[PDB]
Amino acid sequence: MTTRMIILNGGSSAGKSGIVRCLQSVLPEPWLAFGVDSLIEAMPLKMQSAEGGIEFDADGGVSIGPEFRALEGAWAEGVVAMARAGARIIIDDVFLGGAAAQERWRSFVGDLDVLWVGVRCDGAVAEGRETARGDRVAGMAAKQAYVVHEGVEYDVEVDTTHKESIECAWAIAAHVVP
Amino acid sequence: MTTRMIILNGGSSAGKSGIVRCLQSVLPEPWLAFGVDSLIEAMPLKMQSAEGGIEFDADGGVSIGPEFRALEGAWAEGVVAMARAGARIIIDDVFLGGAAAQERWRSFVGDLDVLWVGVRCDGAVAEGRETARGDRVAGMAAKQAYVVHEGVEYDVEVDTTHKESIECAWAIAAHVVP
Amino acid sequence: MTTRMIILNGGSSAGKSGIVRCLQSVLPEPWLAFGVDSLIEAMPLKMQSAEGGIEFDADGGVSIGPEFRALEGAWAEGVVAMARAGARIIIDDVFLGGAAAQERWRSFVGDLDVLWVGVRCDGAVAEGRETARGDRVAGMAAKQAYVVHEGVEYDVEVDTTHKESIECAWAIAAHVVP
Amino acid sequence: MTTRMIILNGGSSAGKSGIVRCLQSVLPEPWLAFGVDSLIEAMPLKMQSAEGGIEFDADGGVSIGPEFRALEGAWAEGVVAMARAGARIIIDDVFLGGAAAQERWRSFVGDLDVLWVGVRCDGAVAEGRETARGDRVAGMAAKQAYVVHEGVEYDVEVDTTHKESIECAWAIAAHVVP
């Protein structure tokens, strides 16, 4: 019935974070936000320089080793648990593995009421925003713009190519069941 | 002949910073960027809590005392000097005083070749972006969206309401004389 | 047997974060780090301007309403769950309620193997570091330097008044059971 | 007579920034702060990935090309100009070239009244702090701890190995002539 967790999926620079902050502002009840970024933040710095962790090549390519996977899995069960405990949770992620990534989340979520959101944005535009934002490693936006959505099922889809974050947030909130 | 300094004026959240980073990326020659933000950054923390400095009320209103003015004046002469010394300078500012602010800059710039840029964006949209970005004090975007341009003369005008930063950057670069 | 979660308690500017990063570097196994700061980060911005959330007065005093408490409780169960799922968790917090705060954590932790760490630092010194770091609201360091430890039981205690973060980290790691 | 500019030199993680913020707090008159960091910040992102700019190898080594040098030179004349215009300026830098770097600054400073400050800190300790702070590229602290001071003349020297930032700041302020 009541939406317990909102999960956004989109390529780097698709506007996920902005939409999330907008959602936190728009939604009447307090929603805690967590995403792959804050996850990286919580991992030890040395994790960005390892095997089973995460590394970014020159052109923005990204690869995830098993060490990273293990931690992420536990982190996933944690946020799910937060929701299970009564806290409304918003999660933004980048499904590098497309549908597989969704399945992974599905395994952790169980019968929890989740609102699956797709955040699209044209590759060239995303790339431009990537430059505007000043992201360290250029190239991610273009590389992730489309593949991350392949085979992924959404309850709602927003496209930031021509819609502001606040507007996308409004569309998403509309589907949130209190 | 050659453009020595580019000065952007626009309300908070109009997209100035993003355009600046885009300009730095687009322009072939290295352009140093400085703005009211980095200026605040360079001022002592206690300056945000003083008389002659800067304070933000509850609704996003902003006021500048003489202490702030004095420092800013010196900072202005400095960047102008940087340009005079051969470094290409990009400056983004918020002309709270409208035309008066432009005159102030004019006094410091002298006969230096400057490209005056106006960065517009609808108030409501700016406000939305202000929320998306997560700015501490909400209200600035709306309050500054229009007044900062009153009586201000520009060599080029861009409107981020429906144009990406990179696109605005392209428009601006086109007017930059090597 | 094996330590599953490390919980550090100390006043603002006692050096908790630095020690945590050192621990992440020193410890051979990957430890995920979370603390009151990242929690605030995950809460909606408007939570810093509410009743049941968190507010900071002029002199650095801090108060926590029920809205905040509710979220924090769920967040607590989450990290505990992360640990329960096999991820090594490091948590730094500020026990404003002294022993009561420890009891709260005890209720969530259950029989989970936890290493309780106390991070002390002289008030005047902490205050100085608070200034050095450039923290927005001055006054917290002094106000929290001692009360947060009243009635709190620790497995290990470190004092950063005359010990570097890395050194304190070494002391703490020594008590971590693989 | 009156001190117009304070220039601090020290290896990465020697505590320069903290001392600077302390100085801004301690000193009665408003002092603007600028340093190699804010300079990097003002340079285009692509400058960290070029020839004549700045690059950091794997072990924390740093090299500066001519492109970087040119900009820095202009930036130097700028801050000097700020001081010449009546603004009190604080500058923290890392003299990779030792005495040569001081000479460079001397050429730009001219007869301006400057207070030269040396900020020392043991290499091993600095390294530890580098880890505590979470600096991206480890290794700088150790590599720069001593060479940056070779042949460099100071009006005042502080050592953060066993002195807090605030204390070092007090020592430095004592030499500031109003």
Burial of C28: CB neighbours in 10 Å, binned 0-12, 13-18, 19+: exposed
Cα torsion C78, A171, B137, A79 to 10°: value is 10
Contact D26, D172 (CB under 8 A): no
- Relative to beta strand B156-159, strand B54-56 is unpaired
CB A63 within 8 A of CB A55: yes
CB pairs under 8 A between B and D: 101
- Would the CB atoms of D78 and B74 count as touching at under 8 Å? no
Ramachandran bin of C32, using left for φ above 0, alpha for ψ from -120 to 50, beta for the remaining angles: beta
CA-nearest residue to D131 within chain C is C22
- If residue A81 lies in a helix (H) or strand (E), which one and from where to where? helix A66-84
Cα C71 from chain centroid (whole Å): 16
| Architecture per CATH, C2-178 | 3-Layer(aba) Sandwich (3.40)
Whether the CB-CB separation of C84 and C50 falls below 8 Å is answered with no
Structure tokens at D124: 């091993």
Short-list B79, B75, B73, B78, CA closest to B6 = B79
Sign of CA dihedral C81, C84, C85, C91: positive
Can A155 be counted among the known catalytic residues?
no
Instruction: Evaluate whether C118 touches C152 at the Cβ level (below 8 Å).
Output: yes
E strand or H helix that includes residue C19: helix C16-26
Give the A:D interface size as CB pairs under 8 Å: 4
C-alpha distance across the termini of chain A, in Å: 8
Method used experimentally: X-ray
Among residues A37, A122, A155, A159, which one is catalytic? Answer: A37
Residues of B with a catalytic annotation lie at: 37
- CB burial of residue B48 (10 Å; 0-12, 13-18, 19+): middle
In chain B, which residue's Cα lies nearest the Cα of C43?
B134
Say which amino acid occupies B168.
Answer: C
Of D72, D79, D88, D105, which is closest to residue B81 (Cα–Cα)? Answer: D79
Please judge whether D81 and B81 are an interchain contact, meaning their C-beta atoms are less than 8 angstroms apart. Answer: yes
CA distance A126 to A36: 18
Interchain proximity C128–D21, CB inside 8 Å: no
Locus of tokens 């939305």: B128
Cα gap D43→A1, rounded to integer Å? 52
Q: State how far the Cα of B162 lies from the Cα of A176, in Å rounded to an integer.
A: 28
Q: Which residues of D contribute to the annotated binding site?
A: 10-17
> What DSSP letter does each residue of A4-60 carry, written as one string?
-EEEEE--TTSSHHHHHHHHHHHSSS-EEEEEHHHHHHHS-GGGGSSSSSEEE-TTS
Going along D52-97, which residue ranges are E strands? Answer: 54-56, 62-64, 88-93
Residue C53: phi and psi, rounded to 5, are -115, -135
E strands present in chain C? 5-9, 31-35, 54-56, 62-64, 88-93, 114-120, 156-159
Whole-angstrom distance, CA of residue A111 vs CA of residue A16: 25
Residue B141 near residue B130, CB atoms below 8 Å: yes
